[PDB]
């Protein structure tokens, strides 16, 4: 694919995704699965005023990935911007 073509397809696809998003369900379980299982994110940061998705990720880990992380020796760091400042910034 030529870069102009990739940029065109990316522009069209991104605009369609966003155009439908507010009229389509949020599939956040599967989103977390991509992060925790597929992409092997050792650390996840919630940007935001509150730790809402950090709390969700904690629960998902404990309910679904604890044995998986133990088997892979994976150690996970879930951090929220408004709580974990000196960690995120040293």
């Amino acid at each position: 694919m030529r870069p102009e073509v990739e940029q065109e397809l990316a522009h069209t696809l991104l605009v369609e995704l966003l155009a439908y998003q507010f009229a389509s369900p949020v599939r956040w379980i599967e989103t977390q699965d991509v992060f925790l299982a597929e992409q092997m994110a050792e650390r996840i940061v919630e940007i935001g005023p509150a730790d809402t998705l950090s709390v969700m990720a904690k629960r998902t880990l404990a309910s679904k990935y604890e044995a998986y992380d133990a088997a892979k020796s994976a150690q996970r760091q879930i951090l929220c911007y408004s709580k974990d400042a000196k960690e995120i910034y040293y």
Partner: peptide, 26 residues
């Protein structure tokens, strides 16, 4: 959203849309 502003390299594999819940791909 201008087409010229798009870098596919920032999206592909890196962005996960809420609609698909998969890494963005062309």
């Amino acid at each position: 959203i201008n087409k010229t502003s798009i870098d596919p390299a920032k999206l592909i594999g890196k962005y996960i849309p809420n609609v698909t819940a998969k890494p963005f791909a062309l």
